[PDB]
Write a structure and sequence with these properties.
The protein is of the alpha/beta class and 317 residues long. The protein has eight helices and 19 strands. It has one domain: L-arginine/glycine Amidinotransferase, Chain A (5-stranded Propeller), CATH 3.75.10. The two termini are 21 Å apart. The structure holds potassium ion (K). It is classed as hydrolase.
Length: 317
C-alpha cells in the first residue's frame, strides 16, 4: 500500500467511490447536434434529472440560455464557458489521491476550447490547482478497480502516443498502479469504456455478442478469452440487436454506464437486453440502484452515457 515515488504516494480512484459532482458539457446550436438539438437536449434532461436525485450535477455551456432548460431541477449547478465537444469524458480532468489529498490531472488532448475549459473551471469555480501531465490520454480509454489495477485497450494508448513497456511504466507511475491489463481484442477514438469495466474490485463487466452472424461475435469472443485469463469475476453485457440512423450502424454498448452516489446509470436502447443487463448488474451490485436511461440519441455522435460525463470525487482537496 504505502508506496512513494518521487515525493508522492498515489492511489487511483474507481468510479464507485463517493463523488461531489457529475459534470457534463451541454449540446448547443453550434456543434454537430443541430439537426436533432431538441432530441439530445431531451435525453440530457432525463439523464440530468435521474442523476440529480443522487448527487449534484454541474452543466457547462457557453450561454445562460443553454441552462434555461435545466433551471427547475434541484441539485443542478451551471458554469458559463465556451465549448463545442460535449464528450467531457474525453478531455475532462481526472482525479487521483496524491499524498492523501484529491488532485485533478489535466492530460493533453488532441483541441482548443476543450483544453481551456478545464483551466477556466478549476481557476474560476473550484479555485484549485490543476496539475498538467504531458501525456496523451482520454478518460474513456482507462478503467480502475481501486486496488492498483487498470484496464485499457492496446489499440488506444499505443496509437495515441514510446515503447509499450515505457507507456506501461509511465502509466503505472502516474496512477500508482501495480498492474495494467492490456486488452488486444474486441471492439464496438477506441475506448475501453465501450468494451469492459470494473463494477467492483473483483469484477469486470464486458460486452459479448450471442449472434454468430454478427461481425462483433469473434472479436468479443476473443476479448472474453483474454478476460478469462485475468482471474477477475466476469459479468456479460450482450450487445443489443443492430440499431441504425440514416443507414449507419450505431455503436450501442451497455458498458458505457456511469457510477454515481448510490446508483449505476445504464444506457437503454429499447431492446430486450436492456432488461437482461439491468437485472444482471443490479444483482451483482446489491447496494446500488440500477437505472436505465434511453441513450439512443447519444449514439448519433458515437458516444453514450459514460462518454458524456466526468466524475469529480468527494474528499479533502
Ligand atoms: K485534458
Amino acid at each position: 500500500e504505502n508506496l512513494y515515488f518521487q515525493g508522492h504516494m498515489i492511489k487511483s480512484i474507481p468510479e464507485w467511490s463517493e463523488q461531489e459532482y457529475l459534470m457534463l458539457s451541454l449540446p448547443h446550436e453550434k456543434s454537430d447536434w443541430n439537426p436533432y438539438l431538441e432530441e439530445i437536449l431531451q435525453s440530457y434532461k432525463e439523464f440530468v434529472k435521474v442523476v440529480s436525485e443522487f448527487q449534484k450535477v454541474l452543466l457547462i455551456a457557453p450561454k445562460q440560455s443553454d441552462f434555461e432548460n435545466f433551471k427547475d431541477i434541484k441539485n443542478v449547478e451551471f458554469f458559463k464557458c465556451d465549448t463545442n465537444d460535449t464528450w467531457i469524458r474525453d478531455f475532462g480532468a481526472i482525479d487521483i489521491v496524491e499524498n492523501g489529498r484529491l488532485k485533478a490531472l489535466d492530460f493533453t488532448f488532441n483541441s482548443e476550447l476543450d483544453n481551456a475549459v478545464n483551466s477556466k473551471l478549476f481557476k474560476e469555480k473550484f479555485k484549485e490547482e490543476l496539475k498538467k501531465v504531458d501525456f496523451i490520454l482520454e478518460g474513456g480509454s482507462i478503467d480502475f478497480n481501486g486496488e492498483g489495477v487498470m484496464l485499457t485497450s492496446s489499440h488506444c494508448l499505443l496509437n495515441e502516443n514510446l515503447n509499450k513497456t515505457q507507456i506501461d511504466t509511465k502509466l503505472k507511475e502516474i496512477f500508482g498502479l501495480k498492474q495494467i491489463i492490456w486488452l488486444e481484442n474486441g471492439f464496438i477514438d477506441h475506448h475501453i469504456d465501450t468494451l469492459a469495466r470494473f463494477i467492483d474490485k473483483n469484477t469486470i463487466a464486458h460486452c459479448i455478442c450471442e449472434d454468430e452472424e454478427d461481425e462483433h461475435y469473434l472479436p468479443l469472443q476473443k476479448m472474453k478469452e483474454e478476460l478469462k485469463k485475468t482471474g477477475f469475476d466476469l459479468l456479460e453485457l450482450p450487445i443489443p440487436k443492430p440499431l441504425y440512423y440514416e443507414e449507419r450502424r450505431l455503436g450501442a454498448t451497455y458498458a458505457n454506464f456511469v457510477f454515481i452516489n448510490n446508483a449505476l446509470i445504464v444506457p437503454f436502447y429499447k431492446d430486450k437486453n436492456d432488461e437482461i443487463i439491468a437485472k444482471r448488474l443490479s444483482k451483482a451490485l446489491p447496494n446500488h440502484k440500477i437505472i436505465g436511461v434511453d441513450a439512443r440519441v447519444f449514439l448519433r455522435q458515437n458516444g453514450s452515457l459514460h462518454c458524456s460525463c466526468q466524475n469529480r470525487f468527494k474528499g479533502l482537496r
